[PDB]
Symmetry: C2
Amino acid sequence: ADRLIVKGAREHNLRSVDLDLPRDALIVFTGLSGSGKSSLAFDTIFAEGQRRYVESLSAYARQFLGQMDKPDVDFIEGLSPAVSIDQKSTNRNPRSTVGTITEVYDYLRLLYARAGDLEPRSFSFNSPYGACPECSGLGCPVCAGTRLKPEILAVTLAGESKGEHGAKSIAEVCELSIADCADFLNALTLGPREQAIAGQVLKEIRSRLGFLLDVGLEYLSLSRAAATLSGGEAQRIRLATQIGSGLVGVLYVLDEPSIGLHQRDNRRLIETLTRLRDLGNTLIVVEHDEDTIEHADWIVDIGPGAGEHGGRIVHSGPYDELLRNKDSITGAYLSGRESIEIPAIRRSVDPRRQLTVVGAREHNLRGIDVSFPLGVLTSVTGVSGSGKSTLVNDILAAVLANRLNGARQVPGRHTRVTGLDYLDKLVRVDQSPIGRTPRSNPATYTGVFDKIRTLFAATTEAKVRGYQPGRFSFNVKGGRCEACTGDGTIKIEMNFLPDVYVPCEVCQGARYNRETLEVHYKGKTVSEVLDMSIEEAAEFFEPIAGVHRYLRTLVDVGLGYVRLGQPAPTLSGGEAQRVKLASELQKRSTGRTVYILDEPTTGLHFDDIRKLLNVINGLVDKGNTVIVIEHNLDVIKTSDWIIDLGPEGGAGGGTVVAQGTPEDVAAVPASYTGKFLAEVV
Amino acid sequence: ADRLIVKGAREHNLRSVDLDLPRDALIVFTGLSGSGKSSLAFDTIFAEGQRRYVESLSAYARQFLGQMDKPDVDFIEGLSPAVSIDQKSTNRNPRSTVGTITEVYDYLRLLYARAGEPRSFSFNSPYGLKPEILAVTLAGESKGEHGAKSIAEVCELSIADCADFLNALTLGPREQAIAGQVLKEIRSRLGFLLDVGLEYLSLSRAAATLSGGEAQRIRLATQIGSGLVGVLYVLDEPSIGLHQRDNRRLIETLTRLRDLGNTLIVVEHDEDTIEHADWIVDIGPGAGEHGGRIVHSGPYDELLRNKDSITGAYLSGRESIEIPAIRRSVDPRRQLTVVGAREHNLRGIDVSFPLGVLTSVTGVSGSGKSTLVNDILAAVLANRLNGARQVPGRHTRVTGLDYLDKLVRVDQSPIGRTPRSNPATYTGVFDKIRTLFAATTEAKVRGYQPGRFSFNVKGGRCEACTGDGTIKIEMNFLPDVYVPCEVCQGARYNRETLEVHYKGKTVSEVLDMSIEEAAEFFEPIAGVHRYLRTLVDVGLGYVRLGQPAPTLSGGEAQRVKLASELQKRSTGRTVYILDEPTTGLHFDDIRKLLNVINGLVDKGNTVIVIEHNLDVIKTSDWIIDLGPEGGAGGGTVVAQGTPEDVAAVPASYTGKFLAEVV
Ligand SMILES: [Zn+2]
Ligand SMILES: [Zn+2]
Ligand SMILES: [Zn+2]
């Protein structure tokens, strides 16, 4: 029976949903932000699917797996081992490059060991043999950037230098040059009788190289540090690795593969996915992308709204069935019932109020000078990896924070920045998590927790118990649980699989001892008002106007489903970005202040995008300058000023392909973004 | 394509063989013992599959997987998740019962919690068998006990109906709605346990109170209960320790597992398994250097038509093991009879053993035949004939015992737990070879003593491996493995000792070289010639002379002990005890070992052996059947006498199978 049949998912907001899906099909999960799509996708399905097989690895593995909490499920049928790919894995290992994680570099070491003598364990910078002494293999002037020892950089296939620019293939930036060199120039160097001994090696190499080419990663160097890799890039090289693995029948759960992906690469990505299912695998992807939804064999919609309203199932069937189903906001958006109108009136670009950066020579950027209107919604486009985030984050944000906020951070290579007197302060709405500990949470982060604790101290139960606001603070020893030390959870080292939390055993996750919870304000204790969400907190804290100011903004930004007592690590990057944005909304919007956005459309439904654009429109209407980097066509057609980068990524590109209003960008044919925009505008 | 493809398999015996097999089919490896069946199957396909799929685990996994040696294979594709069920893993876990391993125990705990807390029902929690939990009753039968009566005493069938079907009609609507799925899972798992023919045993029996085959059967029952699709399963002679009646039932279980969506590869000498095999692959003729090839690859009929396959000849009728037309006379006066064997399930029966004759022990598995034969008989015989002080099983006494000189217990246990022991060390030729090497011009001009050439003596052995030839590096998630020492490259010696050459041969050279070629090599040396002749006769020629003890199978170790005791004067009377020597032996191997045993008994000696192989039984002149079933139901003599005596008796299942031959 080639069908996956499940019953009784109840993870967070799931009312025991029962599902049945055909095997070896393109399954897409969709819903509003926080509708539980991630729940079904990962927690209910992949956890069980992986763990069932991981038990079979050994008897000892079952013992090490028994300590975690099995998902709240009724029954599952037709299960097979599954592999998940996500952006959560962003290693910042100093001795890690692209070649190390791909493990392709070690294979080139093997090839140079055999062909060409040469041997591995001496080319590897992770070991002192290949580690240059002045940098410990990290990459110091003595090593001349190339982390390997100079002798290793010198030895070759009887030539001049397989090093000082990578080993003739690593620091080689574009994978096109690497592939051409290794496949043709290096292959023919061997002697009369080496075909039968190295052709299989070359075939193993170039197949993997073609795999990296297919996923659209033909630009970045193999010697780039892993810290310089985004979450989307990590998801991409993971996808390439699993494509090259060659296993058949494994399930795969994906979380928006098109993150940070230019509009041009969508069809190529779809092509790379389709052949994987043609092998005999099955794909389940959470997406808001129209094309992938159209090409998907099956679509499973999820309960309307998020949180309590979400967690249901709206649709389960073909794309036409989803379009017929009117209960799906996604279906309405796709079939045309819902859309976002292009603003007929665009904010006028001010030639005088014009920020400009000159001579940005950092990395692949060719010292280009770009001007940005002030007080007008402006967007930055361009193909993936063209360094569009590079100049912005390294140079512009750093300089603006140095000169306006007084921050001490080193900017990238550039000459200088014009003006800047037209704005008051820098706003950097990053996508990094709010906090790295369960102690940090939206209540403490936004400071509302202080107001709640002070109000709690001003209650009858607290004043008769002599409980200070600190007694209601899980962060301090006062009132917190003696086992969870206020976290409410205990982190457990899990040896090979990614690390997981377990709930506290004394307070059962209350973050407090039972004595502190005896206080009640409006019938809610500290914990009771803690786990109760912001959307239902809006009506609960209406009398407290000061606290109401925060929750109003968190409601406006569309985060009703989120929990105040939800730990910061459990919050996604986009959710943390929204938390920072709404906290900034809990301020006095000056007439002039620059707002910086980094792909805010992450993990948002079309209605969520329409909600957030309404929020940001008011902010721009304050005369404030807003800048955002995006690949979504709707925000491109909505913004009044758009500047395209490229036309290539990495070393190729780094120049201004086009700029101007959406009409201006669509007029330019050299801009791929303009090519996709002309179809709409 | 749904076809496994293999190229360039060279590890150990393999001579760069290339394979191509269908997927989701039952394929059986066959050949002579040591032809390369176990090596080729496990070491290449299972190792490759498991290693490759563990590479798809996490970043921390790969760095710890790169340490072990990659297989000597070129080009294999069509790979799928790997699971092996073998008899190697004999866990000693004191707090592990049958139910816990098969995970049904958790289901019973949950069911009794919902119909009485499952954690309070287990012995691994401070809440919980303690007497207070025994007060909880689910009276599906007249008796309601959470394992106190169900798991403790009544075996698979009885616990099954009493706690799954009797209470299936005494369950209230709330208990039904709350635990029906759990009870149904219990029923399905118990049915699977019934199918594999493990019905005889109770489920509270200790984990350690099992054989390797019993542990293997628990393992494959767990694999049945896992419910995964698309995983190939490799089996290592599951028919061991299993009655021929259960053979077809086990075949049914494997066929249902394959129909579930899996593929199966089994190395077996069983005729029934070969006949039931969808595909059969034969391996190069002979063992050792002679093997390592491919003879047949196709249907069973193709193997029959293949005249180059010894297994093909045996199955086609060209080769067979013939019943001895003349049997040794049973002497009623020479008769050793135990009395009152109350140990385990044995119901105090008295069993008479004829002397100066070939006798085999039969009966369905688990009926305590091993219990009696080892615990009572072997311990008593070692106490009185060898003087060893070991406690025998519960019995009264044994008649006679004055008709034999000493006990010869040939156990299947491995020769040694460490590479410190090799065949040369065990058989004693290591002293002779060391003295011979010291008696050379190179050794005497180097001032080298016999101990210099020893790997257990510091002088001469490698300073890193101390003569082991390998270094152990711990494996975190997978079982620990050995990687050879790089200082000596596994030579177990420093290079300063390897310059000595007797007949132009160094210590490591003659160590690696097998006894098969050592037979002609040490022909002038008659003293070592007797030893090598005994190994050749027993059938260990293809084994490496210096092969480490851990790299030796149980049957090979038993054969090594048999040859070592064959390096002795076979008296007119001495008892030999055997424990299923058929393990890992082709029909021709069975025939030659039968010739060896016939020669041994022809010295007037008395030999006893436990077996399920019909050829061994039919050759045996005297047979005594145990039964009627295994476990507590059983432990009584169903029949005894000549092969015709047992075959005539229909109550004897072994007699039922023998009546077909006789
Ligand atoms: Zn250096
Ligand atoms: Zn706690
Ligand atoms: Zn060594």
